[PDB]
Amino acid sequence: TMYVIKRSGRKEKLDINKIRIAIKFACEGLNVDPLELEADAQIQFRDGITTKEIQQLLIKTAAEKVSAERPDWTYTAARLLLYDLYKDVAHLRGYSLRDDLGKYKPYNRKNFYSFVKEYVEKGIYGEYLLENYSEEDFNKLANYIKPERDLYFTYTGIKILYDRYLVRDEEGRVIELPQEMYMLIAMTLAVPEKPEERLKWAKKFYDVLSEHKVTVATPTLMNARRPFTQLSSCFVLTVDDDLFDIFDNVKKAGMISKFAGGLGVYLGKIRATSGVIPVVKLINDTMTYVSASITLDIWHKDILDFLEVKTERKKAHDIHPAVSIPDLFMKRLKNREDWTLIDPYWARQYITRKIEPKGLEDFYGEEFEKWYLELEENLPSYAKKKVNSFELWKRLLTVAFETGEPYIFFRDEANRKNPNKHTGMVYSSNLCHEIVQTMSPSKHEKPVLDPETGEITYKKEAGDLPVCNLGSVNLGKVHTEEEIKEVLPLLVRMLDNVIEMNFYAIPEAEYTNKRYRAIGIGVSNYHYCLVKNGIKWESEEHLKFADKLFELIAFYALKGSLELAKERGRYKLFDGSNWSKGILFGRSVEEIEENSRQNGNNLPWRELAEEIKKYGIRNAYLLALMPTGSTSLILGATPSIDPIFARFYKEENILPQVPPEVDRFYWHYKTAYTIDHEWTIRAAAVRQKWIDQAQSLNLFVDPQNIDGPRLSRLYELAWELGLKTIYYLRS
Amino acid sequence: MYVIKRSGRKEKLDINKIRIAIKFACEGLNVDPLELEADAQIQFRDGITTKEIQQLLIKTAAEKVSAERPDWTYTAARLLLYDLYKDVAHLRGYSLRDDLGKYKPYNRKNFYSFVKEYVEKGIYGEYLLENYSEEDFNKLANYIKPERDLYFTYTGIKILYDRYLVRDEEGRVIELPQEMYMLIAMTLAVPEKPEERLKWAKKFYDVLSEHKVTVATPTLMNARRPFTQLSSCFVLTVDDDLFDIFDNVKKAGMISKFAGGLGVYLGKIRATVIPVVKLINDTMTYVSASITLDIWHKDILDFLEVKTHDIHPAVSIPDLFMKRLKNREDWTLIDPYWARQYITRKIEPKGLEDFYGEEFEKWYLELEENLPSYAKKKVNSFELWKRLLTVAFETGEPYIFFRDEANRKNPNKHTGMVYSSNLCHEIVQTMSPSKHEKPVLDPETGEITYKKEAGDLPVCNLGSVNLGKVHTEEEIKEVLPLLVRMLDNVIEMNFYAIPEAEYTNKRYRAIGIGVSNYHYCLVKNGIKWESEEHLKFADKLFELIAFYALKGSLELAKERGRYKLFDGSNWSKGILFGRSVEEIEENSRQNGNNLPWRELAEEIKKYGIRNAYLLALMPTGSTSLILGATPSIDPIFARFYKEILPQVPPEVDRFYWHYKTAYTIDHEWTIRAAAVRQKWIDQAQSLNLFVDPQNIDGPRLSRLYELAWELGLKTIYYLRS
Ligand SMILES: Nc1ncnc2c1ncn2[C@@H]1O[C@H](COP(=O)(O)OP(=O)(O)OP(=O)(O)O)[C@@H](O)[C@H]1O
Ligand SMILES: Nc1ncnc2c1ncn2[C@@H]1O[C@H](COP(=O)(O)OP(=O)(O)OP(=O)(O)O)[C@@H](O)[C@H]1O
Ligand SMILES: Nc1ncnc2c1ncn2[C@@H]1O[C@H](COP(=O)(O)OP(=O)(O)OP(=O)(O)O)[C@@H](O)[C@H]1O
Ligand SMILES: Nc1ncnc2c1ncn2[C@@H]1O[C@H](COP(=O)(O)OP(=O)(O)OP(=O)(O)O)[C@@H](O)[C@H]1O
Ligand SMILES: [Mg+2]
Ligand SMILES: [Mg+2]
């Protein structure tokens, strides 16, 4: 007689029937063969095996079977893991998975209040949960949880969630279940709401999260619950040519990278050659000590050395370079003409003495060109350098092809579209290059010593430091007007609540968020949305459909922000904005109304333009298509606006990934490296008409299929059609 | 046939005018004017400029400087001085001739007009016109002694002319050496009571112009100007904390741009520290800093190998390590982070480094067993010791800090402790990190307000005594109190760039007095370096310097008030240089000085002293080249060498063989001599060791370092070869 070791030490006679039951529950409703997995378990059986070992084998074997031809094995693997998690957490919190009548209850509604209370008192959960909810509130919300929504998770979804999202105790054990996580996130985001409305909003937030219609960013997904509510995704720093500010921004970069991430740094003001790259080296070393973008204008004298940072004694391998390019450079490139490099220091002096200093970088477009033409002659030989446009352009694309960097920032279109151009301008984007928000450096005052006490007090006037508060819409489940009309206003509300509940580590961050209340709404499952609507990627139908879809998203994004303004008040800096003059996405309402008719949406854009002029909007910025990374893997969605990499592939920590309904739509899905990205860019240009910020546009090129002069044509077309950024260039 | 003059023009060559220039320059000096006259005949060419002729006489005279004919240096110096006088006279629009037609290099009448004009151009500071009347300037202008320019060697005046004499916007020298000294004295006299000011300006001018003392390089080139940067060095203490680490990185960058002499202690930082070392290095390059680490720190192996590139490593060594090295025993490396937690939870955290000596050993023995395997690392003492001396022999670094003797001798041990020294390793002053508070945003305005509680950040305010001219009790009794007063005035007139610097200087009022011409002082007193007579003479001399240093600080306390943190110090309990007055009184009798040490101990207990620290033998560098002195307490490198800057010891011809060069000396004597001096020095000494690869081996080099520790030295500096 063969034996098996159980959780409670002990020893029990092998029962083949109990393994059959576990497999049957896990395969229920799913297009798989339970007999196949039963056979594999017979082969994997060994006398004295632990019940824990048996469960780990069924999970792994099921995950090994995931394919483009049988994708449902992922759901079988996920459930087998879920059934193991339920048992672990039940034993840790001291309840049973059986009720009075002996039915299976993975979730314990009675335990919810006791559980959260205990781990609030251990410093794992934040105090604001007990302060803003009564025992009856907890009990009411515990009974609202829908345990059947755990059946929405792919194996990689729950595996990623289990590995670094589900909260753990001091000894590193998982304590909360997926639906408990979602409810606690909803409860955290509902705190800023009026006490008589709080439970009503917590239920709506829980619904839209648990049903996988929207997701909040990774920071919010793992911190909204905890004492330290770090909910911010990225920061954008502006550095003045000044020992004090340079070392101040180096400090912020170090503080940011320890606690948060997504750092972007503009060094275009810094003096030309110590120079600028010692400052780049200085930021690099703080990065290593504890994922940051550094931006430089393409006319900066040190640009040649800056492009070579990631590829002779002056390199930096922990930073991501980016290049701010004006229209004039692109105009020069057409006729293969020459390009004059300049030093900001001598450029600043000249302009400042020709009129609170003003450099060249403090102008864009029509004005910038006037100053540049005058500066490229009337400056002395020591503050200039002559180079060929095509020679520079060619070397950039060569580095881009080998390293993937640098990222591009088309500063002229970015600035003339900035709807808050009345409060300043924008010198760079963030790391992922979706953000376009007004920015400026902090100003310092001389410190003061009190000899009696020994305390020193220094003061600084806060500058505009864009924080990004991010979420995304699952286009798999939200693509109709009815679905968009419900969901977008709810996501706008959640992200405005994120700003109120965020723990601010940098004071300038708090100052900027309170004045602007900027948010970034993106999308996932874009490619799946096209395929199930029978739309080919490389077609006129793609461009026409993208136009129609992103019009709806923009309309109900503004509608949502308007309602918050009526209810909470407009953002402080609304008066003077493009919004306040009835200019939406840098276009007249007559232009939009004509676009609305061609799209077959026929939305009331004029009536909305009038209500925004009267009541304002709650948020200074709204839409930015960010790279969606871990949040789409949890949703089982295709990433952002990217075309899929493959119909099936893996990763390592095994994370097998298939697009939604890949078996049903096999050939309707076309992989990234097989697509002519002239279409990708035309499609992005159509979307850009309804996006106030930018898009993290990747380009996927095959060395065999693409050459030097064709790669140039893509980048040139991006500029021509009015894109503000380009992100990674993969191969 | 013809020569071009300053005023364009053309004049018939006159061989007599070159003879006169050479005669004035050789007057009273042991040289051959005919030799230099012959060389000038060879160097003559038709259409040569008078300027070119003068540059040739200067260079030729400098080329003749040797150990057998040193007076050529004075001939070269004077020929340069006569050129400087002409240049400055033409720039300020006066003549070198008076009413009767006598030679007047200095224009007493022009002094007020000159300084007034260049104050109004932003070259000289406003405090000069604010604290002195036209009659004051005129009185001090008439006190100047132009004959004191005859005290300069060629390298002395050449260094002074190149780096120190103030220049206008077009880069031309405007002030003469004696004008520089008077303007320095006038700047240091500003803090004095208006009815006493001129009296102190004349005394400061006298002691500077007569080359009896010098102030540090910063004071020598800035005391005169609007930006009075008079500080020589700073010592930073860094807490294991993002905010403080980046705060100290900012200070290091601010300090190195404007000042220098930086020292940084990183012994508190968490074990894998070198990313922080790399971070300090990059700020240094962006715009000469020491970094110190305890020898028990887990990252010490990687830290020793940093220089095998813009930083100078140093190692804090406790007694226990040296005790282990005797029996060739093992040495347990530790991480401060886990060491701090253990000690802190066993009772504002308290780490291992926050203890010394008797207490430190108790904690270390307990930490070396009861800690887990991940927070430890076992290594052999002799294996580590040997690798340190190997790097020291190849690179010259690391410098050494014997922290136990340093801390038990700290006379201000009641306000904290000392983790490291400065760059040059003469400084031993109480130090601590600044403590940070959470910033505050006013949403209505844009303004953020940050608070931090200032920590003890030692600034060093430095000068030195010329032992060539000040070695008797009568000379020391006059000069030392005057130098103490000048350095206390330096603290009042210093422009503070870092607020913690201002806070520390005002609380402690620490000063550092060193020496130059030590080797010359021994030789002219007929004392052999490698002898018992050296040890006996050093004892006697440094007793006198210490006694009249304390006397000087006492007088200032009676007059200006004791330093804020006096009460609780070793000074206030009558413990001088970590010894009882009965011990000192016995030492005073053996030295044949018989000084009233008990009476002084009592007066210090009653009235206090003005300065928290007094004595530190710093490397004397540029200031001794100006004085023509042998550097600090070092034995001379050579009887003659170049840097063209030809350098000879004083009276090298007269004392040729009595002078013994550095690489020929058994430095067992150097260390014994330093140990005797250390009994009368409250801080430390920048002790260099000069070893010949052929004459010394591995085990003998170890014996020197071991003996330094045994005899109670607090630091060792460069190891040259
Ligand atoms: N006697 C058995 N023979 C075969 N498989 C078994 C046996 N007992 C448990 N298993 C299997 O072990 C896996 C893990 O189940 P489970 O986590 O409930 O372990 P357990 O040891 O039965 O724990 P507990 O007694 O706490 O419920 C399941 O797939 C189950 O079918
Ligand atoms: N109704 C159900 N639906 C899905 N999974 C279930 C259900 N009932 C139990 N499970 C899961 O099946 C596994 C076995 O649980 P169960 O308590 O039945 O243990 P067993 O090993 O089958 O029996 P026993 O513990 O009595 O020896 C666990 O992972 C559990 O979460
Ligand atoms: N006619 C001359 N023949 C030879 N040497 C001369 C003659 N005139 C000047 N010198 C030499 O030139 C050197 C520099 O002299 P000085 O600085 O006085 O220059 P200068 O041209 O005479 O200027 P000034 O006339 O303004 O005094 C001296 O060594 C001096 O002997
Ligand atoms: N009494 C003196 N003692 C020392 N140096 C002197 C003396 N008189 C002049 N000199 C210096 O010697 C040089 C002589 O310059 P000065 O103009 O006096 O005469 P010169 O150049 O020989 O001839 P001339 O007067 O025709 O120009 C100058 O460098 C001057 O500073
Ligand atoms: Mg069981
Ligand atoms: Mg002349």
Numbering used by the authors:
A (entry chain A): 2 to 274, 286 to 302, 311 to 331, 336 to 379, 409 to 706, 710 to 787
B (entry chain B): 3 to 274, 288 to 302, 311 to 331, 341 to 379, 409 to 704, 710 to 787
Question: What text comes from the article?
Answer:
Class I RNRs are composed of two proteins, a large α-subunit (R1) and a smaller β-subunit (R2) that exist as homodimers, that combine to form an active heterotetramer. We present the first structures of the A. aeolicus R1 and R2 (AaR1 and AaR2, respectively) proteins as well as the biophysical and biochemical characterization of active and inactive A. aeolicus RNR.
The tertiary structure of AaR1 is a homodimer, where each monomer contains an “ATP cone” that houses two ATP molecules. The AaR1 ATP cone has electron density consistent with the presence of two ATP molecules, which is highly unusual, as R1 enzymes generally bind only a single ATP ligand in their ATP cones. The second ATP molecule (ATP2) binds the AaR1 ATP cone in a manner very different from that of ATP1. The individual AaR1 monomers interact, forming a dimer interface consisting of four α-helices and their associated loop regions, as well as a novel structural feature in which a β-hairpin (residues 495–515) from one monomer interacts with the equivalent β-hairpin structure from the opposing monomer, forming a four-stranded antiparallel β-sheet across the dimer interface. Interestingly, closer structural analysis of the AaR1 β-hairpin revealed a unique π-stacking interaction between the Tyr511 of each monomer, a residue that is not present in other NrdAh sequences. In the AaR1 structure that lacks nucleotides in both the s-site and the c-site, loop 1 (residues 275–289) and loop 2 (residues 303–310) are disordered in both monomers. The two cysteines (Cys235 and Cys521, AaR1 numbering) that are known to become oxidized upon product formation in E. coli R1 form a disulfide bond in the AaR1 structure.
